[PDB]
UniProtKB/TrEMBL annotation, chain A:
Subcellular location: Cytoplasm
Gene: pgk
Recorded family membership: Belongs to the phosphoglycerate kinase family.
Stated name of the protein: Phosphoglycerate kinase
Sites where the protein binds ATP: 28, 117, 148, 176-179
From TrEMBL, chain B:
PANTHER family, A to Z: ATP SYNTHASE SUBUNIT ALPHA, MITOCHONDRIAL
A cellular component term, taken from the record's GO annotations: proton-transporting ATP synthase complex
Primary enzyme class: hydrolase
Domain (ATP synthase alpha subunit C-terminal): residue spans on this chain: 350-427
Residues the record lists as binding Mg(2+) 1: 155, 183
Chain residues that bind ATP 1: 151-156, 401, 403
The protein's name in its UniProt record: ATP synthase alpha chain
Keywords: ATP synthesis, ATP-binding, CF(1), Hydrogen ion transport, Hydrolase, Ion transport, Membrane, Metal-binding, Nucleotide-binding, Translocase, Transport
Subunit structure: F-type ATPases have 2 components, CF(1) - the catalytic core - and CF(0) - the membrane proton channel. CF(1) has five subunits: alpha(3), beta(3), gamma(1), delta(1), epsilon(1). CF(0) has four main subunits: a(1), b(1), b'(1) and c(9-12).
Family: Belongs to the ATPase alpha/beta chains family.
Residues noted as binding ATP 2 in the record, renumbered to the chain: 344
Keyword Metal-binding: yes
TrEMBL record, chain C:
Residues binding Mg(2+) 2: 259, 346
Annotated coiled-coil segments of the chain: none
Descriptive protein name: ATP synthase beta chain
Amino acids binding ATP 1: 255-260, 285, 435
């Protein structure tokens, strides 16, 4: 995966998109600092999006977030005003044991009291689909959702099907272990076997 | 046992006495071949209208009658297809012998199925008329009234809608109320000639027949249609016409003793017609899964759509096809008034390819007609106005088709796209060019191995503009150009004919070799 | 004080709803992605905006509104109970006290002879006949003597025969009403029309024919119309203002895109005004009713709309009772819950026709054109309960069919006696490709006056109407003589009028599934400013083709600048 990591980095087909799926913001901040200069549209998936929302004066409840990275994300938003994409619609469950999703009919951006988010919903799916179809190349490396149970894994499968159904000449990269598992289970132009290699390359 | 006896006979109505639990439209049996329905009833008396007649039976005062206690059911026999029958199921004309066992017995006065039993109307019903297919679409499950004056081609329009279903899974039911037997026999012969007899039924109630039979004819016909719909079939029903049905009901009510209303009709004429034209539509898979399309016909007097019955029918139906006497006198056939006509279903009732092909025809027709009317008063006409007059004349020539002529749906879509793209303007009031083009396209999309696949993709999928442009400019345009040049000779000298046709291949030699081999004019790409 | 104490009052649905009214500051608004801003704007019912600055300004302007700030402040304090004044009361509980049998039958009219009764029969009461495991309601019409009544069916008359036993409580027809009715489809007599199992509607029984007033004087405690309802549609907002608590007649249709008009209106009232909607479909086509129900489910305004469909195939009595049932549902939603209601009638002409049919069936001498003698009184009975009080406003949009375009028909005259505003849809404009196809010349509204609008709005509307009329007059000269046969002033007037005509076109939100272009919701001030700028000729250099189906004047200016710049860039 040396070619897919080097050629797609030195001479990427701009415009490009970044799909950073992860559990913590601090987890992939460096790639972001870099991606803040490599690309213009940035899709954030996982609890990093929840950290962004908590930085954005939005009720989240008790979803896990890097409170130390909250102020850093807010400052990044202040400096970079059109370099982030955040989900709007979610499929929420109070518990974690494969609970049926609860949908917010009105003012979906706000997480209610006592509720916590697990996966992005169909409207967020469409919002991200527009951006990925608009762009040229992708670096999918995150299960924006929770793969532990199917109640919060349909978002990652949906985004994977959307990216894999983009007919044309769209270049694709892989940088996530859970993304690798999702790709293997689904049945990318060249998905790196190990996401750690791409993570170190983009670090 | 005969528990009723006749006491008076006035105005062909039978007054019967006896103790019974009478119901509205209950069947009373006067013999094994004579029966009637109940109009009004006391606790011990009833008024009955007879449905048929017997030469041997002479109904008099004192005759005995039997009250069945149930409303009228029509039986379904296997030889209804390809036959002309009564409202009692007797075969007047037949092509196959009857098995003498009823498939089912269906109430003729059922209630229309409710809202939760329906499904969206989204599949075209191929009428076979270019203007109706393109500008006034009809879906499967729609109610499209055909309204106009006497002798303007409404029956021909309905007959064309039935003949266009030759190669289709749609069962035709033609109900004639108060029509002539000569016309009905002519329609039967037309069905036999065009090879739709094996799938078409005729329910006849001529003007000579009993008024109650002319009243019940549409109900029995649509009960048969509902029988066919219950097993997932698509049914197309024509009522010819509903004004005679309304007149028959008015006569029945006035003779029974019902108080007159506006235009001397009974007070429930609207409910009579509306309860009939609401049991037709598309139904969900668990409620039969089929559909019933209806094409009722209405006659107006001197183009007055303000009458009671025409107003009710316009209020009930999903759209109207107006036939104009003025347009008929101007040579237009079929004389369909596109301005007055409306179709509430719209594009939803078309295919995606046809919805794309016929996007902006209404504006073209409207401004063309306006400029045509004003052309007799102006002197200075703009270049844009001249160009739109030219395009409008082309469109008006396009939709002029002969009687009993079926033009296929994709052919109409292709002709619309050719009109909008400018390749239907070189001629000068010449029709043979359109006939040749239609024949070439029909044999291309029917008598071919690649044209068949192109027809299938046009039927099933909605393509974008780019691949359509490739389709037109790579196969349709060269073939059409060669055939037009071979048939129309002088067209080469036309500047506009060659200005638009310079960037199209010259397939003359291959197609000349094809036609020398004896192939039909328009087949191409014989890779078989 | 304590959010925890407050949360114990609001129900889960109530807090979820109150998440809408939470306010975001300008700094808070700034730190949003454009899709987040679009989602928040959509949730507040203001369409879509690609520009970030305009979207933020619109959200701030809506937030900086008296109603919005009141409802946001009330979202923090504990729940306040709406204590009703003059509420609707349920029907009295009774046993069946009158018993008789059918002695004369006809088409839709049945005569009942009372056998055993503990109390005297009252007019307009309902008899119940149970046949083949189904009940049939017969409304009393005339009482000939102590033991004989005439009745007409409410529904299907199949199965009624001489000797059928009927029992009555000596009460009018009643239906179950509650907040649970919101989101379901029923008919005038309460029967379920959206699932085979017929899941019951929970609520209290109410009689739609009983007004329940202390005295006649109570009917005169009514607020005269003073407010204007905003719709986000440029033509209606500018030239045809809609009264709040009044009546608006949507006269026209048929291929003019009327359906989109009623959908857009229901959606705008459900979202932008946070109101309740009642749709009473009188003489409703089964296909059109099914399609409207499915589209309401698909666009997400079903859950706040109550559907009462009197179908075309039912008896005249049920089609008559449809409007009364709708009015009763609206009255329940306003008097008992305090919520403003938008009542929809379709069609008024069919309600008049059903009344005429019933009157003719009961052997009453017809009036002019065969109509019923009590046509105007029936129209008053329907239309005088759509009023405005302290509890809330019931504003009604009524669609009428004019048969053969005869505005002198008695039904049209009777309806015009009550319409505070009229919106006339033109088939010619629909053919021309102008949507929403509302003719701004022959339509008018009584709220376009100094008592309700700013003088700026009045002058803008008058100038627009005069300009459009002059342009229409000059277009004939254009068609006959030519563009070079006019004066310079007339040329300028023609160009300004063409720009004004094409600016009033608008793409609707509920239609973006088909058009594929996002719909718009133009606020009144923005449309007023756009028309003011267009009237001044400040955009006469732009070709008219850029004015078709746009949101605001700023969009026209930006698109023209973009196109021209890019043109020059290539050059
Ligand atoms: N497309 C057509 N091209 C040529 N002739 C036509 C066409 N359509 C109808 N006609 C002719 O017009 C005449 C009247 O047609 P048709 O019988 O359908 O009219 P109608 O409106 O049903 O009349 P009626 O009131 O007598 O029942 C016939 O002579 C028929 O052949
Ligand atoms: N923007 C549009 N462009 C073209 N056609 C439209 C548009 N909007 C609506 N229509 C069509 O106009 C027709 C109007 O009929 P409808 O909305 O049912 O009103 P009515 O009930 O008065 O006939 C619809 O069937 C619809 O297909
Ligand atoms: Mg005829
Ligand atoms: Mg309608």
């Amino acid at each position: 995966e040396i070619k897919n990591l080097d050629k797609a980095l030195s001479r990427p087909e701009r415009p490009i998109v970044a799909i950073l799926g992860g559990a913590k913001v601090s987890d992939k901040i460096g790639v972001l600092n870099n991606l803040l200069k490599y690309v213009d549209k940035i899709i954030i998936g996982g609890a990093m999006a929840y950290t962004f929302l908590a930085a954005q004066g939005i009720g989240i409840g008790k979803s896990l977030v890097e409170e130390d990275k909250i102020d850093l994300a807010r400052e990044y938003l202040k400096n970079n005003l059109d370099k982030f994409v955040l989900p709007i619609d979610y499929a929420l469950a109070k518990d974690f044991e494969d609970v049926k999703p609860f949908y917010n009919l009105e003012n979906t951006l706000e997480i209610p009291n006592g509720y916590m988010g697990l996966d992005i919903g169909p409207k967020s799916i469409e919002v991200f689909k527009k951006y990925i179809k608009d762009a040229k190349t992708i670096l999918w490396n995150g299960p924006l959702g929770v793969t532990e149970f199917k109640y919060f894994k349909e978002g990652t499968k949906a985004i994977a099907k959307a990216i894999t159904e983009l007919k044309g000449n769209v270049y694709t990269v892989v940088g996530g272990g859970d993304s690798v598992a999702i790709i293997e289970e689904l049945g990318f132009s060249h998905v790196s076997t190990g996401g750690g290699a791409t993570l170190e390359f983009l670090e | 046992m005969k528990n009723l006896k006749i006491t008076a006979i006035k105005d062909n109505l039978i007054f019967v006495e006896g103790e019974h639990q009478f119901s509205f439209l209950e069947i009373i049996k006067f013999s094994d071949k004579v029966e009637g329905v109940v109009l009004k009833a006391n606790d011990r008396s009833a008024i009955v209208a007879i449905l048929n007649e017997d030469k041997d039976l002479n109904l008099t005062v004192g005759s005995l009658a039997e009250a069945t206690g149930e409303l009228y059911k029509i039986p379904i026999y296997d030889n209804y297809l390809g036959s002309i029958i009564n409202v009692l199921g007797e075969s007047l004309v037949k092509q196959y012998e009857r098995t003498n066992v009823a498939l089912d017995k269906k109430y003729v006065f059922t209630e229309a199925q409710p809202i939760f039993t329906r499904s969206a109307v989204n599949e075209p019903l191929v009428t076979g008329i270019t203007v109706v297919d393109g500008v006034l679409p009809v879906g499967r499950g729609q109610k499209e009234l055909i309204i106009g004056d006497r002798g303007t081609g409404k029956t021909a329009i309905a007959l064309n809608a039935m003949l266009a279903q030759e190669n289709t899974d749609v069962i035709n039911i033609f109900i004639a109320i108060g029509k002539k037997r000569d016309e009905i026999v002519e329609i039967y012969g037309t069905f036999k000639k065009h090879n739709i007899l094996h799938k078409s039924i005729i329910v006849s109630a001529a003007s000579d027949d009993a008024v109650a039979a002319r009243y019940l004819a549409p109900y029995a016909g649509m009960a048969i249609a509902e029988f066919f719909q219950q097993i997932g079939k698509d049914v197309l029903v024509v009522m010819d016409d509903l004004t005679n049905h309304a007149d028959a009901y008015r006569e029945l009510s006035l003779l029974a003793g019902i108080a007159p209303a506006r235009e001397a009709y009974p007070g429930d004429i609207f409910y009579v017609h509306s309860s009939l034209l609401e049991r037709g539509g598309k139904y969900g898979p668990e409620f039969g899964g089929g559909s019933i399309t209806i094409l009722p016909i209405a006659q107006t007097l001197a183009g007055d759509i303000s009458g009671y019955i025409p107003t009710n029918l316009i209020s009930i139906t999903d759209g109207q096809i107006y036939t104009s006497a003025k347009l008929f006198n101007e040579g237009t056939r079929p004389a369909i008034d596109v301005n007055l006509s409306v179709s509430r279903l719209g594009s939803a009732a078309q295919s995606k390819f046809m919805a794309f092909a016929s996007s902006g025809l209404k504006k073209i027709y409207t401004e063309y007609k306006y400029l045509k009317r004003l052309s007799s008063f102006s002197s200075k006409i703009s270049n844009r106005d001249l160009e739109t007059l030219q395009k409008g004349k082309a469109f008006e020539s396009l939709i002029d088709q002969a009687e009993y002529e079926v033009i296929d749906y994709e052919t109409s879509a292709i002709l619309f796209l050719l009109l909008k793209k400018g390749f239907l303007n070189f001629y000068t009031e010449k029709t043979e060019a359109l006939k040749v083009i239609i024949g070439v396209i029909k044999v291309f999309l029917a008598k071919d191995v690649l044209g068949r696949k192109m027809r299938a993709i046009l039927v099933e999928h909605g393509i974008d503009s780019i691949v359509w442009n490739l389709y037109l400019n790579h196969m349709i345009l060269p073939l059409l150009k060669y055939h037009l040049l071979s048939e129309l000779q002088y067209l080469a000298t036309n500047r506009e004919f060659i200005k638009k046709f310079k960037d199209i291949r010259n397939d003359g030699r291959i197609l000349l070799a094809y036609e020398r081999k004896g192939y039909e004019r328009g087949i191409a790409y014989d890779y078989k | 004080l304590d959010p925890e104490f407050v949360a114990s009052t609001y129900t889960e649905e109530e807090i979820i709803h109150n998440l809408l009214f939470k306010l975001y500051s300008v700094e808070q608004l700034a730190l949003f992605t454009i899709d987040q801003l679009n989602a928040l704007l959509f949730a507040r019912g203001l369409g879509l905006e690609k520009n970030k600055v305009r979207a933020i300004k619109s959200l701030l302007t809506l937030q900086t509104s008296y109603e919005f700030m009141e409802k946001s402040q009330a979202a923090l304090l504990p729940k306040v109970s709406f204590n009703p004044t003059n509420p609707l009361k349920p029907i009295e509980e009774k046993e069946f006290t009158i018993f008789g049998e059918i002695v004369e039958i006809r088409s839709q009219v049945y005569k009942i002879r009372i056998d055993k009764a503990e109390e005297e029969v009252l007019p307009k009461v309902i008899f119940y006949a149970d046949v083949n495991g189904k009940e049939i309601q017969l409304e009393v019409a005339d009482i000939f003597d102590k033991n004989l009544v005439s009745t007409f069916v409410l529904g299907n008359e199949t199965g009624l025969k001489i000797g059928t036993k009927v029992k009555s409580k000596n009460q009018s027809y009643a239906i179950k009403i509650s907040k649970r009715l919101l989101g379901r489809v029923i008919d005038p007599i309460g029967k379920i029309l959206d699932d085979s199992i017929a899941t019951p509607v929970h609520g209290n029984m109410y009689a739609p024919l009983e007004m329940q007033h202390d005295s006649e004087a109570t009917r005169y405690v009514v607020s005269p119309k003073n407010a204007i309802l905003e719709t986000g549609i440029k033509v209606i907002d500018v030239l045809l203002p809609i009264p709040k608590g009044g009546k608006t007649g949507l006269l026209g249709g048929a291929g003019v895109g009327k359906t989109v008009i009623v959908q857009e209106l229901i959606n705008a009232f459900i979202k932008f005004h946070d109101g309740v909607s009642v749709f009473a479909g009188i003489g409703e086509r089964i296909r059109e009713g099914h399609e409207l129900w499915k589209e309401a489910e698909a666009l997400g305004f079903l859950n706040k709309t109550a559907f009462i469909f009197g179908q075309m195939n039912e008896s005249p009595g049920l089609r008559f009772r449809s409007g009364i049932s709708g009015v009763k549902v609206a009255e329940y939603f306003r008097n008992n819950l305090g919520k403003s209601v938008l009542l929809f009638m379709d069609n008024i002409f069919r309600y008049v026709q059903a009344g005429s049919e019933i009157s003719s069936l009961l052997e009453k001498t017809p009036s002019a054109v065969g109509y019923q003698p009590t046509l105007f009184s029936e129209m008053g009975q329907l239309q005088e309960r759509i009023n405005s009080t302290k509890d809330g406003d019931i504003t009604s949009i009524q669609a009428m069919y004019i048969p053969a375009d005869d505005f002198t028909d008695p039904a049209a005259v009777a309806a015009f006696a009550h319409f505070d505003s009229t919106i006339i849809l033109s088939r010619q404009l629909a053919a021309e490709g102008v949507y929403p196809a509302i003719d701004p010349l022959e339509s008018n509204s009584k709220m376009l006056s100094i008592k309700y609008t700013s003088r700026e709005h009045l002058d803008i509307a008058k100038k627009t109407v005069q300009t459009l009329e002059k342009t229409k007059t000059l277009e004939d000269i254009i068609n006959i003589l030519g563009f070079d046969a006019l004066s310079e002033d007339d040329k300028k007037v023609v160009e300004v009028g063409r720009r004004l005509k094409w600016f009033l076109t608008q793409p609707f939100v509920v239609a973006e599934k088909f058009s594929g272009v996002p719909g718009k919701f133009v606020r009144l001030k923005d449309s007023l400013k756009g028309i003011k700028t267009i009237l001044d000729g400040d955009l006469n250099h732009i070709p008219v083709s850029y004015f078709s189906f746009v949101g605001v004047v700023e969009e026209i200016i930006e698109k023209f600048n973009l196109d021209a710049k890019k043109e020059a860039l290539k050059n």
